[PDB]
Symmetry: C6
Subunit: 60 residues, 6 copies
RNA sequence: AAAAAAA
RNA sequence: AAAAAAA
């Protein structure tokens, strides 16, 4: 698996990320955690993002 | 699984939530219940939202 | 589980007017006639088979 | 258990149908055959339609 | 299955095809090959198209 | 994936500039760094993770 | 087929 | 959240 090491590196190093959704919308924050189906993305608030809705995850 | 505790905390504490859909539409209400495939969001009425149609779930 | 089946079953077994919003934002209206694992039969003037994968939300209208 | 008898009746009786795609596009033909993932839609020329791209099937 | 014999006939007989995508874009070419998840479409180049992105496959 | 793996392998091994069209019409460009069952790592000025479910087509640029 | 409408 | 842009 490539997801877990990629996402964990971002979380452990607390790098600012952009999550681009499939609808073109760009979410920004830090990766708090993730499982098989979701990523929790945090700024001032934690939100649950469904991977099915994500196109890409990119360091900001 | 991160999904069940995230949703259950929202449900159990009656948090006002925003559910953003993959078509960019924002729904608002409280998480009434959920299962493997759907979330029941209650404002004036209970509406069943398929998780496949959801991009994000956020406290409002 | 399970919430989906009892929610649809009550709408069906009570013949309640519903709106089914599709993921593209089109709103379909009528009554839940029937459903299975993958589809919902929506009865109006003509009865139609709606794929669940295309549905965002089901609500009483 | 509901999808297959529905599609089988349209096929057997050669019912003119509309297949609305998830992008709103409306295809018209009669259902030639179908399997788990696709439907063959017949008009002048026959075309294979992926179910994942279909929203609804309705007699025309 | 009717999908494999449908695609196989197109490939074997080198029939010019239109592949309509879920975003409404129309691709044209010959079916070079396919597997469970993708189709290789040949026009001026060979391109790998994910089936999940495809609405319809039609002889042109 | 007897077609998918050799196609991506050749682009990665040969460091071929690629274009990835997403299902929403947006085109990404870069080189394929690696890929697995669900994602492609695409590298340009940075490495980004692209979900395959969001991809329509991969082609050499 | 808008390197991407914090919706 | 155009009962639906044969694309």
């Amino acid at each position: 698996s490539l997801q877990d090491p990629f996402l964990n590196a971002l979380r452990r190093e607390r790098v600012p990320v952009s999550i681009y959704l499939v609808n073109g919308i760009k979410l920004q924050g830090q990766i708090e955690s993730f499982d098989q189906f979701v990523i929790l993305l945090k700024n001032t608030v934690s939100q649950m993002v469904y991977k099915h809705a994500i196109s890409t995850v990119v360091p900001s």
